[PDB]
């Protein structure tokens, strides 16, 4: 889901 990408990017960095 495209609307999940920023969440995953944020988690990957956080």
């Amino acid at each position, epitope marked *: 889901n*495209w609307f999940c990408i920023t969440r995953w990017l944020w988690k990957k960095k*956080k």
Partner: antibody, heavy 127, light 109 residues
Framework: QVQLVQSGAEVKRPGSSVTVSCKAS????????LSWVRQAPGRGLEWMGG????????NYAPRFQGRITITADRSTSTAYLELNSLRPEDTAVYYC????????????????????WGQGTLVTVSS | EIVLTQSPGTQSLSPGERATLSCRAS???????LAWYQQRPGQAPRLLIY???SRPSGVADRFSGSGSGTDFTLTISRLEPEDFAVYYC?????????FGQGTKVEVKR
């Protein structure tokens, strides 16, 4: 405090193309989803597509694939919407909206839903 | 291609009254990613609820959202003058996001 400022009103002839801009300020640009929603006079909201600046990851609604191009310049925190082969049916106010962030602050984990909206840009398509 | 249904399209209610709005989805909405927006005439939409039930900071508590799967509901405990407007529900459970046609809440007098 996320503020989105869109370019001014446009008047186009059918078949022509239009490019509307959206400059963000008051937060980070790259790591947040930014979409384009439109609303025809007296009608409902329509999600058109979006982009994640960091890797220019675009997501277009099938209905516009081929006529729509969404870009984003990280150097100026500005996103763009280009719509080609305009038709009177495309007459509408176009809004750019950025997803909100968890709880307080704005560096929290994105929420997907559109919390920030530009002022809107009226694009008229007529002869 | 999730179709969102909001009905009635219009409701007439008295001030201070409670309001409940419905939003049906053709298919299950992924991760319950359902959101509600408020839009007053001449103004841009405003996010009221996201994640089917999370109220973002800066939004009065008289606004509550519920539901899951394909059934969802927005509730306004008491309608203040500024609450009479159009409400749209959107689902972002998949790459192709969609909005309902909206429900308009007018003042019954």
């Amino acid at each position: 405090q996320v503020q989105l400022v869109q370019s001014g009103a446009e008047v186009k002839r059918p078949g022509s193309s239009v490019t509307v801009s959206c400059k963000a300020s008051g937060g980070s640009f790259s790591t947040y989803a930014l979409s384009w929603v439109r609303q025809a006079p007296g009608r409902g909201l329509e999600w058109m597509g979006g982009v994640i600046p960091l890797l220019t990851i675009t997501n277009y609604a099938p209905r516009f694939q081929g006529r729509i191009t969404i870009t984003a310049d990280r150097s100026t925190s500005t996103a763009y919407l280009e719509l080609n082969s305009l038709r009177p049916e495309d007459t509408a106010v176009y809004y750019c909206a950025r997803e909100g962030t968890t709880g307080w602050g704005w560096l929290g984990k994105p929420i997907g839903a559109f919390a920030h909206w530009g002022q809107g840009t009226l694009v008229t398509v007529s002869s | 291609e999730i179709v969102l249904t909001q009905s009635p399209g219009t409701q007439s209610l008295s001030p201070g009254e409670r309001a409940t709005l419905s939003c049906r989805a053709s298919q299950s909405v992924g991760n319950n990613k359902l959101a509600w927006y408020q839009q007053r005439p001449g103004q841009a939409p405003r996010l009221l609820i996201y994640g089917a039930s999370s109220r973002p900071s800066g939004v009065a508590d008289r606004f509550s959202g519920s539901g899951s799967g394909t059934d969802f509901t927005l509730t306004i405990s008491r309608l203040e003058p500024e609450d009479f407007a159009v409400y749209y529900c959107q689902q972002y459970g998949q790459s192709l996001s969609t909005f309902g046609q909206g429900t308009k809440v007018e003042v019954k007098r």
